[PDB]
């Protein structure tokens, strides 16, 4: 790892620590989970997602190179990646003990039923769980995890990106930092084809993004559902 690559990693780790609270303190402020419209978990999960978008923005701002992109390109990258980075960053609370996201409260332990009660079907939910499990099984170090989120966000192939050459240059610098980290630090057998496996997770995220988008488009078209969404969610997923 070069001095620059070490600095990239330190910046990303700090950014994550500043935008991911592992105590889940802020969750009391969300509208309450209702588990008893049948979309009873829509308000709570809308608030959780809206909060998560704010954190992804805060993280992206710190990725080296990101703020040198035009405003338009920064916006395109964030609107297109937000759901994906949310899925990635949620892996940190995900637990293979019961295939749930454990966020420090009995009622903030989210399961497949919860996501269905925000309007989603198993067409999204089952691949989502498979994704979380596969990702957990990679046993990523925190450095690998934050690099992967950064690479996800800085993707030159997102629809509407203007300066794809600059976005690619930034992404390749992050990708090379990741490959060097794996070579230098990740022990066998976990390191074997790790970079490839991580790149595959990015491809899996594109598929989950497409399905989430389709389902979101449908559920949000119902004014009773849309009225329960936050302005930020409406804008970012719109």
């Amino acid at each position: 790892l070069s001095e620059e690559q070490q600095h990239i990693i330190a910046i990303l780790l700090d950014a994550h620590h500043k935008t991911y609270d592992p105590t889940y303190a802020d969750f009391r402020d969300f509208r309450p989970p209702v588990r008893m419209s049948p979309l009873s978990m829509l308000p709570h999960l809308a608030d959780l997602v809206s909060y998560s978008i704010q954190k992804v923005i805060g993280f992206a701002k710190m990725i080296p190179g990101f703020r040198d992109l035009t405003s338009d390109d920064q916006i395109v990258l964030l609107k297109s990646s937000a759901i994906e980075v949310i899925m990635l960053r949620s892996n940190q609370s995900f637990t293979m003990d019961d295939m749930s996201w454990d966020c420090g409260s009995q009622d903030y332990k989210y399961d497949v039923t919860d996501v269905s009660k925000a309007g989603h079907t198993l067409e999204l939910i089952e691949p989502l769980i498979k994704f979380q499990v596969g990702l957990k099984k990679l046993n990523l170090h925190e450095e690998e995890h934050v690099l992967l989120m950064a690479i996800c966000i800085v993707s030159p192939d997102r629809p509407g990106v203007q300066d794809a050459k600059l976005v690619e240059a930034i992404q390749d610098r992050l990708s090379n930092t990741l490959q060097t980290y794996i070579r230098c630090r990740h022990p066998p057998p976990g390191s074997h084809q790790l970079y490839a496996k991580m790149i595959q997770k990015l491809a899996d995220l594109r598929s989950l993004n497409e399905e989430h988008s389709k389902q979101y488009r449908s559920l949000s078209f119902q004014p009773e559902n849309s009225m329960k969404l936050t302005p930020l969610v409406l804008e970012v997923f719109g």
């Binding site: 703020r67 405003s71 916006i75 964030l78 609107k79």
Partner: peptide, 9 residues
């Protein structure tokens, strides 16, 4: 709107 305003600078 909200995104642009947050990213402004």
């Amino acid at each position: 709107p909200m995104l642009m305003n947050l990213l402004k600078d």
